[PDB]
Structures are given as C-alpha cells and as structure tokens.
C-alpha cells in the first residue's frame, strides 16, 4: 500500500509550559503566546498554544495528526499536545502573525524581493506537502504565518487530507468551505487534488501582490462558480508584470492537469527572485527594509523550535 507513518506524537506536561498572553479568540478556541520549557533541558521554546464538544475534540486531534506528520522548513510543525480537561495544541510561535495581516500592515515597506521570495517559500512548502501525498484544501494568505519577514510557513491543517494509498482525489462532504479560494472542480463536485491546491496558491499569490485585497470583493460566493465558468478570473494587480500575472492565470485553468506543478512554481518564482524589480514594479522598492516579545527578562536560553530537534 503506502509507507508507515512513524512520526512521533509528543505528549506534554501542562507544568512544562506557561501561557503569557492571548493572541486570538474565536470558534477555533483561544491561542496563547507562551514559553515551553521541557523539564531538565535548559531550553525555553517560544510557542503558540491552541486551547479548545466531543466532535470538536475529534477535529483538533486530526489537525494534530497532520501537523505531527510534516517536517519541512516551510511548514509549521507541532511541538506536541497536552491532554488536560481541555485539549491543547502546542506549536511554534510565529512572531509576526499571518502573512495576510503582515502585507496589510506593512504595504509601504514590502519590496519585490520579499514578495517573490514568499512565493518561492510557499511553493516549496506546498511541493513538500505534495511529496507527502497531503492535500491542504485551505491554502490562503491567512493560513501562512511569518516567522521572520524573510521566512514564512504554511499552517492551518484543519481541512487537510492525507490521500489514501491509491487515491488521487478527496471527495468531501458538505459544509462551510472557502469558496473564493477553491478550484472550480472543488466548488462543483467537492473534488480536491494537489492541482486544486495549485488554484488556491494562485489566489494566495494574488492576495500578496495586492497587499491583502479580498478576492472577488463584494460578489457573493453563490455567484462565484458561475463567474468562473464564464471564464472570468481575478484581475492583474497593479504591481504585477505580465510574467507574474500569467503564472497566476495558469493556476486558474479549467483543466487541472494544465495548471502548473508546485515544483515548476518553485523554479519560475526563483528565476524572478534573482531580478525582482524586473517582475514586480513597486514605487520606492530599492530603499525598503523590514526587520521583550515575551515579557520575561532571562531569555539567555531561548531556542527557536526549528533548532529544537528530537
Ligand atoms: C490573525 C492574527 C495573528 O496572526 N496574530 C498574531 C499571531 C502570532 N503568532 C502565532 N504563531 C503561531 C500560531 C498562531 C495562531 C494560530 N491560530 C489558530 C491563531 C489564531 C489567531 C491568532 C493567532 C493564531 N499565531 C503572534 O505572535 C507574536 C502575534 C499576533 N498578533 C498579535 C500580531 C499580528 N496582528 C497585527 C494581527
């Protein structure tokens, strides 16, 4: 069939980590900024802790399953889970937040080199997920986090599906889905593949190149499947040369097999990242620059999760 998934699921002691401040609260629960100090190791690891219904527990454990099974510099990984009266996911702290919020807040100091590098990094992350036979199903700028302005990672595996041994697609049930990011065949037939992820990657790039605009703003999601069928697509962002826009457009072909592969998106955006001002036209580009967080003073032993292995 397929290879055995030998990922380790680490179970953490609640006394080993300290919540410092709330980062966000919603129906997903409450995310805290915090520190994880595994007993006896003399490391302090900055973490986000997602604290949390018996079906809502089955949902967060599926996410933990997926996150524990990935290991790539451009994908967020799970440090572990804690099974208290509520279930908590402990993941790497990504101090600059979501890329969608980052491009909105810093539109005036984001140059072409950052934008094209992020495109490369997300393609690398998605290519890795495809190698792992994983379909994300919710790729979007809100679901990419910023570790540093130079380093982003794909996150939010709440919808992700490992495709079975001989499965090329996944057929979902019904529910609330992110219509404005989805391939046409996913909207119409609830079918999802690596190539429908390519479609959402195209939409994600469009979000970045417009510094966080909302795709198909105002148009109700009811009408999206019809608009796409007529052959309409998102418009060329002002900063985009035709080279970059043609890549996005190719991600939105009706024939899924004629969309680019993630490994080709890596190559094409890497070429453009070598001469970024040739491919994105940003006023003031050549002079832009981008870069306590825990209210604790003795951070001598702090270690990023990426340097904390086994
Ligand atoms: C959309 C809001 C957002 O991303 N906020 C955010 C996030 C982090 N870091 C972080 N690192 C890893 C995971 C998460 C995270 C995961 N989930 C599910 C979240 C839900 C809401 C907010 C944050 C998260 N968050 C963070 O680390 C210091 C700070 C912030 N904000 C307070 C700063 C960004 N703000 C301008 C929106």
Swiss-Prot record:
Changing residue 278 to A: Reduced phosphorylation. The record marks 308 as: Important for interaction with PIK3C2B. Changing residue 5 to A: Abolishes phosphorylation. Changing residue 135 to L: Found in a lung cancer sample. ATP binds at residues 23-31, 50, 91-92, 156. Phosphorylated on Tyr residues in response to EGF. Dephosphorylation by PTPRJ prevents endocytosis and stabilizes the receptor at the plasma membrane. Dephosphorylated by PTPN1 and PTPN2. The modification N6-(2-hydroxyisobutyryl)lysine is found at residue 50. Ubiquitously expressed. Isoform 2 is also expressed in ovarian cancers. Changing residue 39 to K: Found in a lung cancer sample. Residues 17-280 form the Protein kinase domain. Changing residue 24 to A: Found in a lung cancer sample. Changing residue 10 to A: Abolishes phosphorylation. Changing residue 308 to F: 50% decrease in interaction with PIK3C2B. 65% decrease in interaction with PIK3C2B. Abolishes interaction with PIK3C2B. The modification Phosphotyrosine is found at residues 170, 308. Changing residue 52 to F: Found in a lung cancer sample. Belongs to the protein kinase superfamily. Tyr protein kinase family. EGF receptor subfamily. It is linked to Lung cancer: A common malignancy affecting tissues of the lung. The most common form of lung cancer is non-small cell lung cancer (NSCLC) that can be divided into 3 major histologic subtypes: squamous cell carcinoma, adenocarcinoma, and large cell lung cancer. NSCLC is often diagnosed at an advanced stage and has a poor prognosis. Neonatal nephrocutaneous inflammatory syndrome: An autosomal recessive disorder characterized by intrauterine growth retardation, premature birth, fragile skin, recurrent skin infections and sepsis, failure to thrive, nephrocalcinosis, and nephromegaly with tubular dysfunction. Some patients have chronic diarrhea, and necrotizing enterocolitis. Receptor tyrosine kinase binding ligands of the EGF family and activating several signaling cascades to convert extracellular cues into appropriate cellular responses. Known ligands include EGF, TGFA/TGF-alpha, AREG, epigen/EPGN, BTC/betacellulin, epiregulin/EREG and HBEGF/heparin-binding EGF. Ligand binding triggers receptor homo- and/or heterodimerization and autophosphorylation on key cytoplasmic residues. The phosphorylated receptor recruits adapter proteins like GRB2 which in turn activates complex downstream signaling cascades. Binding of the ligand triggers homo- and/or heterodimerization of the receptor triggering its autophosphorylation. Heterodimer with ERBB2. Forms a complex with CCDC88A/GIV (via SH2-like regions) and GNAI3 which leads to enhanced EGFR signaling and triggering of cell migration; binding to CCDC88A requires autophosphorylation of the EGFR C-terminal region, and ligand stimulation is required for recruitment of GNAI3 to the complex. Interacts with ERRFI1; inhibits dimerization of the kinase domain and autophosphorylation. Part of a complex with ERBB2 and either PIK3C2A or PIK3C2B. This is Epidermal growth factor receptor. It comes from Homo sapiens. The lineage of its organism: Eukaryota, Metazoa, Chordata, Craniata, Vertebrata. The gene is EGFR.
